[PDB]
Amino acid sequence: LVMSQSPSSLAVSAGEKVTMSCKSSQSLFNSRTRKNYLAWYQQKPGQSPKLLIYWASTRESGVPDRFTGSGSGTDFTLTISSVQAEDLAVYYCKQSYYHMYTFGSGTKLEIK
Ligand SMILES: [Co+2]
């Protein structure tokens, strides 16, 4: 199961908005639980990953609503409104539909 992300890199100014995509090779929706098993992680310079959103659109505790996840099946999106300098990082989507979870290659976000 391959996880494809785009674009590879983004360079924007503070206050702008960005949208990144994550496409799964197989549908990640489960009709029994009615949940898309797709998560988004934020990885800051030299640190371990931080879970941001799970079940495609549900935010973790303390995560600002500037971060918005959406999509279902095979095509997902993570949107960041009014980007801030602190958001500088690499964002990864991760599927937990199968035993062995899989990560996408990520989208690097840099602030000008
Ligand atoms: Co999930």
Find the 112 Cα to ligand 1 centroid distance in Å.
31
Q: How many domains does the chain have?
A: 1
Find the 51 Cα to ligand 1 centroid distance in Å.
10
| Distance from chain centroid for Cα 64 | 14
Q: Domain residues for 92?
A: 1-112
Find the 74 Cα to ligand 1 centroid distance in Å.
13
Q: Which of 22, 28, 27 is nearest to 5 (CA)?
A: 22
CATH of the domain at 87: 2.60.40.10
Find the 86 Cα to ligand 1 centroid distance in Å.
24
Check if the beta carbon of residue 64 is closer than 8 Å to that of residue 82.
Answer: no
The token duo for 22 is: 């994550």
- From start to end of the chain, where are the E strands? 3-6, 9-12, 18-24, 29-30, 35-36, 38-43, 50-54, 58-59, 67-72, 75-80, 89-95, 102-103, 107-111
Q: What is the resolution of this structure in A?
A: 2.0
Check if the beta carbon of residue 1 is closer than 8 Å to that of residue 26.
Answer: yes
Find the 13 Cα to ligand 1 centroid distance in Å.
30
